[PDB]
Design a protein around this motif. Structure first.
Motif, PDB file in Angstrom:
ATOM      1  N   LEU E  70      17.363  -7.014  -5.241  1.00  0.00           N
ATOM      2  CA  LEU E  70      18.172  -8.224  -5.171  1.00  0.00           C
ATOM      3  C   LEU E  70      19.415  -8.109  -6.043  1.00  0.00           C
ATOM      4  N   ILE E  71      20.429  -8.916  -5.713  1.00  0.00           N
ATOM      5  CA  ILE E  71      21.603  -9.161  -6.550  1.00  0.00           C
ATOM      6  C   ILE E  71      21.716 -10.671  -6.716  1.00  0.00           C
ATOM      7  N   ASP E  72      22.018 -11.134  -7.932  1.00  0.00           N
ATOM      8  CA  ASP E  72      22.176 -12.556  -8.226  1.00  0.00           C
ATOM      9  C   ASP E  72      23.562 -12.823  -8.805  1.00  0.00           C
ATOM     10  N   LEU E  73      24.221 -13.870  -8.309  1.00  0.00           N
ATOM     11  CA  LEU E  73      25.582 -14.191  -8.716  1.00  0.00           C
ATOM     12  C   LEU E  73      25.775 -15.699  -8.825  1.00  0.00           C
ATOM     13  N   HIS E  74      26.650 -16.111  -9.747  1.00  0.00           N
ATOM     14  CA  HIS E  74      27.066 -17.505  -9.887  1.00  0.00           C
ATOM     15  C   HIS E  74      28.464 -17.682  -9.308  1.00  0.00           C
ATOM     16  N   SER E  75      28.591 -18.559  -8.313  1.00  0.00           N
ATOM     17  CA  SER E  75      29.824 -18.732  -7.553  1.00  0.00           C
ATOM     18  C   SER E  75      29.744 -20.076  -6.827  1.00  0.00           C
ATOM     19  N   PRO E  76      30.846 -20.548  -6.243  1.00  0.00           N
ATOM     20  CA  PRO E  76      30.736 -21.511  -5.146  1.00  0.00           C
ATOM     21  C   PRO E  76      29.967 -20.929  -3.971  1.00  0.00           C
ATOM     22  N   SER E  77      29.119 -21.767  -3.375  1.00  0.00           N
ATOM     23  CA  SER E  77      28.146 -21.358  -2.373  1.00  0.00           C
ATOM     24  C   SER E  77      28.720 -21.248  -0.963  1.00  0.00           C
ATOM     25  N   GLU E  78      30.028 -21.441  -0.769  1.00  0.00           N
ATOM     26  CA  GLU E  78      30.694 -21.080   0.479  1.00  0.00           C
ATOM     27  C   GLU E  78      31.728 -19.972   0.323  1.00  0.00           C
ATOM     28  N   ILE E  79      31.986 -19.526  -0.906  1.00  0.00           N
ATOM     29  CA  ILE E  79      32.603 -18.224  -1.114  1.00  0.00           C
ATOM     30  C   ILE E  79      31.646 -17.113  -0.669  1.00  0.00           C
ATOM     31  N   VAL E  80      30.333 -17.356  -0.764  1.00  0.00           N
ATOM     32  CA  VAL E  80      29.288 -16.351  -0.569  1.00  0.00           C
ATOM     33  C   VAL E  80      29.145 -15.899   0.889  1.00  0.00           C
ATOM     34  N   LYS E  81      29.792 -16.559   1.848  1.00  0.00           N
ATOM     35  CA  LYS E  81      29.676 -16.113   3.231  1.00  0.00           C
ATOM     36  C   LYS E  81      30.458 -14.827   3.492  1.00  0.00           C
ATOM     37  N   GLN E  82      31.515 -14.569   2.714  1.00  0.00           N
ATOM     38  CA  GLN E  82      32.447 -13.484   3.010  1.00  0.00           C
ATOM     39  C   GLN E  82      31.975 -12.127   2.514  1.00  0.00           C
ATOM     40  N   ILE E  83      30.943 -12.074   1.683  1.00  0.00           N
ATOM     41  CA  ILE E  83      30.432 -10.792   1.223  1.00  0.00           C
ATOM     42  C   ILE E  83      29.383 -10.241   2.182  1.00  0.00           C
ATOM     43  N   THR E  84      28.608 -11.117   2.837  1.00  0.00           N
ATOM     44  CA  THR E  84      27.498 -10.728   3.705  1.00  0.00           C
ATOM     45  C   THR E  84      27.931 -10.394   5.137  1.00  0.00           C
ATOM     46  N   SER E  85      29.227 -10.186   5.366  1.00  0.00           N
ATOM     47  CA  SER E  85      29.760  -9.743   6.646  1.00  0.00           C
ATOM     48  C   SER E  85      30.048  -8.241   6.686  1.00  0.00           C
ATOM     49  N   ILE E  86      29.921  -7.548   5.552  1.00  0.00           N
ATOM     50  CA  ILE E  86      30.084  -6.098   5.476  1.00  0.00           C
ATOM     51  C   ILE E  86      28.723  -5.396   5.422  1.00  0.00           C
ATOM     52  N   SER E  87      27.639  -6.163   5.359  1.00  0.00           N
ATOM     53  CA  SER E  87      26.297  -5.696   5.034  1.00  0.00           C
ATOM     54  C   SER E  87      25.397  -5.592   6.259  1.00  0.00           C
ATOM     55  N   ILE E  88      25.964  -5.330   7.435  1.00  0.00           N
ATOM     56  CA  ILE E  88      25.235  -5.532   8.679  1.00  0.00           C
ATOM     57  C   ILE E  88      24.655  -4.207   9.188  1.00  0.00           C
ATOM     58  N   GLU E  89      24.712  -3.160   8.358  1.00  0.00           N
ATOM     59  CA  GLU E  89      24.077  -1.867   8.599  1.00  0.00           C
ATOM     60  C   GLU E  89      22.579  -2.015   8.885  1.00  0.00           C
ATOM     61  N   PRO E  90      22.009  -1.208   9.829  1.00  0.00           N
ATOM     62  CA  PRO E  90      20.603  -1.380  10.241  1.00  0.00           C
ATOM     63  C   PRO E  90      19.627  -0.880   9.187  1.00  0.00           C
ATOM     64  N   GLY E  91      18.316  -1.011   9.384  1.00  0.00           N
ATOM     65  CA  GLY E  91      17.515  -1.119   8.185  1.00  0.00           C
ATOM     66  C   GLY E  91      17.715  -2.473   7.540  1.00  0.00           C
ATOM     67  N   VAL E  92      18.355  -2.489   6.353  1.00  0.00           N
ATOM     68  CA  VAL E  92      18.449  -3.602   5.393  1.00  0.00           C
ATOM     69  C   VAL E  92      18.792  -4.945   6.023  1.00  0.00           C
ATOM     70  N   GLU E  93      18.011  -5.952   5.643  1.00  0.00           N
ATOM     71  CA  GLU E  93      18.192  -7.322   6.082  1.00  0.00           C
ATOM     72  C   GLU E  93      18.321  -8.228   4.864  1.00  0.00           C
ATOM     73  N   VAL E  94      19.045  -9.322   5.052  1.00  0.00           N
ATOM     74  CA  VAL E  94      19.599 -10.111   3.965  1.00  0.00           C
ATOM     75  C   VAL E  94      19.005 -11.512   4.040  1.00  0.00           C
ATOM     76  N   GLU E  95      18.379 -11.950   2.953  1.00  0.00           N
ATOM     77  CA  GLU E  95      17.884 -13.311   2.852  1.00  0.00           C
ATOM     78  C   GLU E  95      18.525 -13.986   1.648  1.00  0.00           C
ATOM     79  N   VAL E  96      19.104 -15.162   1.878  1.00  0.00           N
ATOM     80  CA  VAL E  96      19.980 -15.842   0.924  1.00  0.00           C
ATOM     81  C   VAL E  96      19.373 -17.198   0.598  1.00  0.00           C
ATOM     82  N   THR E  97      19.143 -17.463  -0.688  1.00  0.00           N
ATOM     83  CA  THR E  97      18.713 -18.792  -1.100  1.00  0.00           C
ATOM     84  C   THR E  97      19.358 -19.154  -2.434  1.00  0.00           C
ATOM     85  N   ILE E  98      19.353 -20.448  -2.725  1.00  0.00           N
ATOM     86  CA  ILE E  98      20.083 -21.019  -3.854  1.00  0.00           C
ATOM     87  C   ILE E  98      19.209 -21.789  -4.857  1.00  0.00           C
TER      88      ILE E  98
END
Ligand SMILES: [Zn+2]
Lengths: 140, 138, 70, 54, 98, 141, 119, 189
Positions: E70-98
RNA sequence: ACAAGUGGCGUUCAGCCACCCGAGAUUGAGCAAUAACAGGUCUGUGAUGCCCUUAGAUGUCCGGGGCUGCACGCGCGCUACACUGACUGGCUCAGCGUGUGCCUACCCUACGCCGGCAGGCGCGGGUAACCCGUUGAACCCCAUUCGUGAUGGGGAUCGGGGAUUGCAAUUAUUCCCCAUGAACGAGGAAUUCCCAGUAAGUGCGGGUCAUAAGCUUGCGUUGAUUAAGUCCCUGCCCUUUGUACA
């Protein structure tokens, strides 16, 4: 620690030779219907210290062992210890001792042999009773 | 101030050694209060070997976990000896470290050097690593 | 083995007048030469330390060691 | 037949309550982690699920 | 306080996408606390090889590893949509909670 | 010096705390302490009839070392090895009746309270009552 | 005959709830978890056979496929075929049979009486 | 001043043979506080000789399967047996173990030849490390078999066994079998 | 970490042995060639070729029964034949991992109350490094008793009772209470397995599972004797040799 003049080398109480050279709660195990888990609470309720040998006790506490031993339910040996907790014929709560466990045993055996239920027929034929395999084991 | 481990097995001991007026405490009990006493000299082996004057500036607190009892004892003595040698190399001069390492190594090398032996795995066809089942022929 | 369950009349002078002249006094020591049980050995050889003619050298749950006090 | 005795036996809690999810057999199943295949259909598709010998 | 959670069966794609995500978040300089390596769960199923049980009883050992990060960050929670658009490589899947 | 439980020998201290829990007479003794077996694996009743005070002594020592414990962890501490006859031996758990009655009887003399997390812990008064007994075994050599 | 101190002369007035205290744990477990339609319609035909007899005669033989039934104390007198897989064996129920299973009175196998060993 | 069990001096005991001088490891380097070392010693040829002799002595008492794996039980047994040596004889016990092992290794032995089951044996002599470990095996037999069925417990029996090989009485199964398996090598000649 | 440094052996070449510095100077498993056996499997298959049966079925369902039977063998195993022990109290330590489900009812359990147990009852936590869980595991350790007796080892067989699972426990599923005390005292010809955290002692997880392990698969814990070699035995490969065998 020297032998007293009241030391007994034997007891013959309830017609089994209790050896006077053994400790008391392990001297009384020849009576069928007392084993050790009955014995140590017998000498708990008969208020005798356990440390003595079989000859070291007087006859009054020994007869308190036998008289409280025959009816233990008067002196708070509790209800789950009992040998027959519900009899077939009497329905009383009882702890059956040397010569009465034998008579109740062969009457229950012969009652099973009379009424054509399974277990006494398995008892009469020479088989293991409680579901065991006798294909390989138990050969005489 | 050092904290430096010693291990024999999955038993792991690390001593917390800082400056003081003398102390040895293994999880809050001192070295004379550990349960196996046919093995009492193994924990006391730096105390008998180095002397209580060599411990005269430190407060050593040992915390152990894991393993068995005897592997825990053999991690206690190794962690104590590595605690004193790590304090001596950082805060005392190195010829004292040279003297303490030849007096500790030449007696027994498990006081300073670990044990690389671990339990080898069971494989099939038998109840241990090497042993095999009884293999009737007829 | 036919052992004594408690002490006989002429066993006490054997217990008191042979045994502190023995070199090693354990509960396995007296019962070979006395034909007694080891319970008499443990209880009686523990009681002699309050008579002060022996010294306790070792105590364990399986093996107890006494001797002559010179 | 009658729909009050035909297949009226409970097919909860049985060896006939579970079967292979591929080949309709009930014997020697692998029940762990929701596979529910028998052992042979594990060994055919083993690297296809990702279970790899190492 | 948004924590992105990565899971895979292989270490190399997960290491590339975790390096790429922390590079995209260290180029914009949000507060990112580093990758926290959670312990691997080995699913092991040890079956017998033979389909009829006749031979010398050799056993077969399968396993699969699950790598959980995991990676944990403090930010506005709609800035966070723009990082998870480069992470779409197969294998790894992304689960996001606040 | 200052003497806590963790610095002293644990073979005499539990028996001296058992001597205090006998000699005060404010630990209640229930009616069935003399006929019971203490788990399903043991064979017999205790040799010494003072087992209840000794068991309560060790129980308060275990609440000294690690609190946040309950009955179901007190049975995990007090288990043992079951001989099973001709089968292999097993580990089988301790009795919840003895631990429940000992811990309520130790709550009865204002020595023991519950934890905030639902299990048990010591009071300051029950902390005091054990460190004084550690202070009194500390002089007896 | 007196069973648990209670003869049949004060047993036939009891419900199943009063049977729950002096039977064994098996039958008390059975009337705890409760009975099903097969044994109750068997009980229907057993009562209907036991009313229709002239009072020295037996009831008619009501057979059944259930070896797992309790002897309830009302069944004393009945002649019941209980299916052992080939045969419906005739029971004559007396009050000392109460508390046993119905398959104890239909025996399932032959006495094993051997000859020579083979090869 | 390394003292065994806290109480035993190793400085003074007399190995009176030359052949076992490097093969009974008791002297100053091999002075240890305890008979436990948890060692790696039997991992090479001839590192097991310069294991300490007391450590080999307590490991050879672990032998039968009821007592397999249990080391501290034999540390306790050898502790009480050494105290039994100091009370019954009152001499330094390390001379009693050294005298038992030096005296009881059989100096000649026999080998089987005859092509696997016709018995004609041939006499040769014994290497000193084989003499040392044969002596510890003949000293750990005896005492367990002589405290298998007895009222005597093991510690008096083992310490008396090391005494009975230290002075050479012929009740000693180490000394009795020593004389027997050297005299059959005398006989097959 | 490489036979790399040194000494020796060595047709001075492959290497072998010894010893320092070193965590470590043969860690263990997977993988597995040419090509063959009338080896096993048509009972894993909606992989199958043909033959068979195909409606008073060898399809398919529901119900009792069976695979569990015993003048008797052979094999895998467990438990022991006790004093290094048994029984009672105290003390203190792991580690691999499992955890609420397309099909489908089936779960890990904290803590409080009631019982001597299996259990009953309720509020909680958990889809997991979060809760069970510091996984308070057993053996081992320290004191009590027992005293060589088929004894307090052996707990086989056998009676009454209570609870749990389930549609249902009889041919006792499991558990606990009490009672009962069989050979067995260390096993003969043959033989099985094994070289360092190894054999062995000892427990804990996974499987199968509505209930669940004398089996199997792993995990750790306590931890050695003995060998550092040979072709005598048992198999196997290879070279030379004989053939009328293919
Ligand atoms: Zn499968």
């Amino acid at each position: 620690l020297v032998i007293p003049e009241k030391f007994q080398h034997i007891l013959r109480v309830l017609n089994t030779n209790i050896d006077g050279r053994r400790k008391i709660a392990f001297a009384i195990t020849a009576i069928k219907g007392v084993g050790r888990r009955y014995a140590h609470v017998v000498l708990r309720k008969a208020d005798i210290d356990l440390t003595k040998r079989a000859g070291e006790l007087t006859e009054d506490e020994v007869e308190r062992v036998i008289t409280i031993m025959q009816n233990p339910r008067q002196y708070k040996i509790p209800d789950w210890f009992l040998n027959r907790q519900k009899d077939v014929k009497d329905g009383k709560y009882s702890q059956v001792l040397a010569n009465g466990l034998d008579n109740k045993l062969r009457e229950d055996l012969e009652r099973l042999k009379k009424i054509r239920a399974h277990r006494g027929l398995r008892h009469f034929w020479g088989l293991r009773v409680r579901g065991q395999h006798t294909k390989t084991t138990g050969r005489r | 101030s050092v904290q430096v481990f010693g291990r024999k097995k999955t038993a792991t001991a690390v001593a917390h050694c800082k400056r003081g007026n003398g102390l040895i405490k293994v999880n809050g009990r001192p070295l004379e209060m550990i349960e196996p006493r046919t093995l009492q000299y193994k924990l006391l082996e730096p105390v008998l070997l180095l002397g209580k004057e060599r411990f005269a500036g430190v407060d050593i607190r040992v915390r152990v976990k894991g393993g068995g009892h005897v592997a825990q004892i053999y991690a206690i003595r190794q962690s104590i000896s590595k605690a004193l040698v790590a304090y001596y190399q950082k805060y005392v001069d190195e010829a004292s470290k040279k003297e303490i390492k030849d007096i500790l190594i030449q007696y027994d090398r498990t006081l300073l050097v670990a044990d690389p032996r671990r339990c080898e795995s069971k494989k099939f066809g038998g109840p241990g690593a090497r042993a095999r089942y009884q293999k009737s022929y007829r | 083995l036919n052992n004594l369950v408690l002490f006989d009349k002429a066993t006490y002078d054997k217990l008191c007048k042979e045994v502190p002249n023995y070199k090693l006094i354990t509960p396995a020591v007296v019962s070979e030469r006395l034909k007694i049980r080891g319970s008499l050995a443990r209880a009686a050889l523990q009681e002699l330390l309050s008579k002060g003619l022996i010294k306790l050298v070792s105590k364990h749950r399986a093996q107890v060691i006494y001797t002559r006090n010179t | 037949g009658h729909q009050q005795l035909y297949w009226s036996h409970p097919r909860k809690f049985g060896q006939g309550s579970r079967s292979c999810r591929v080949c309709s057999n009930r014997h020697g199943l692998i029940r762990k982690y929701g596979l529910n295949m028998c052992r042979q259909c594990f060994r055919q598709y083993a690297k296809d699920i990702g279970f790899i010998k190492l | 306080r948004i924590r992105i959670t990565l899971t895979s069966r292989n270490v190399k794609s997960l290491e590339k996408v975790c390096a790429d995500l922390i590079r995209g978040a260290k180029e914009k300089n949000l507060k990112v606390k580093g990758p926290v390596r959670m312990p691997t769960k080995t699913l092991r199923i040890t079956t017998r090889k033979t389909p009829c049980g006749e031979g010398s009883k050799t056993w077969d050992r399968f396993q699969m590893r699950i790598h959980k990060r995991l990676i944990d960050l403090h930010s506005p929670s709609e800035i966070v949509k723009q990082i998870t658009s480069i992470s779409i490589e197969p294998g790894v899947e992304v689960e996001v909670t606040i | 010096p200052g003497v806590t439980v963790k610095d002293v020998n644990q073979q005499e201290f539990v028996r001296a705390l058992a001597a205090f829990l006998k000699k005060s007479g404010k630990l209640k003794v229930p009616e069935w302490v003399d006929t019971v077996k203490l788990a399903k694996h043991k064979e017999l009743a205790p040799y010494d009839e003072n087992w209840f005070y000794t068991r309560a002594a060790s129980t308060a020592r275990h609440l000294y070392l690690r609190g946040g414990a309950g009955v179901g962890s007190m049975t995990k501490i007090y288990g043992g090895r079951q001989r099973n006859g001709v089968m292999p031996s097993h580990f089988s758990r301790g009795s919840k009746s003895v631990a429940r009655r000992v811990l309520q009887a130790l709550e009865g003399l204002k020595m023991v309270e519950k934890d905030q997390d639902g299990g048990r812990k010591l009071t300051p008064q029950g902390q005091r009552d054990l460190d004084r007994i550690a202070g009194q075994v500390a002089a007896a050599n | 005959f007196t069973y648990r101190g209670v003869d049949l002369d004060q047993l036939l007035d009891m419900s199943y709830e009063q049977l729950m205290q002096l039977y064994s744990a098996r039958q008390r477990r059975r009337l705890n978890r409760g009975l099903r339609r097969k044994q109750h319609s068997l009980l229907k035909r057993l009562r209907k056979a036991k009313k229709e007899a002239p009072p020295m005669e037996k009831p008619e033989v009501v057979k059944t496929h259930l070896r797992d039934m309790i002897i309830l104390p009302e069944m004393v007198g009945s002649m019941v075929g209980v299916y052992n897989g080939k045969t419906f064996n005739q029971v004559e129920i007396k009050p000392e049979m109460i508390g046993h299973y119905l398959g104890e009175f239909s025996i399932t196998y032959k006495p094993v009486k051997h000859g020579r060993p083979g090869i | 001043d390394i003292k065994l069990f806290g109480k035993w001096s190793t400085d003074d005991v007399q190995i009176n043979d030359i052949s076992l001088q490097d093969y009974i490891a008791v002297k100053e380097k091999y002075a240890k506080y305890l008979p436990h070392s948890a060692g790696r010693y039997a991992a090479k040829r001839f590192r097991k000789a310069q294991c300490p002799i007391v450590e080999r002595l307590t490991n050879s008492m672990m032998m039968h399967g009821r007592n397999n794996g249990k080391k501290l039980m034999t540390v306790r047994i050898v502790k009480h047996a050494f105290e039994i040596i100091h009370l019954l004889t009152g001499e330094n016990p390390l001379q009693v173990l050294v005298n038992a092992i030096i005296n009881s290794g059989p100096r000649e032995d026999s080998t089987r030849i005859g092509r696997a089951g016709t018995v004609r044996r041939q006499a040769v002599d014994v290497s000193p490390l084989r003499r040392v470990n044969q002596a510890i095996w003949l000293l750990c037999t005896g005492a367990r078999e002589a405290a298998f069925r007895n009222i005597k417990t093991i510690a008096e029996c083992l310490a008396d066994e090391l005494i009975n090989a230290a002075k050479g009485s012929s009740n000693s199964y180490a000394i009795k079998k020593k004389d027997e398996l050297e005299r059959v090598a005398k006989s097959n000649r």
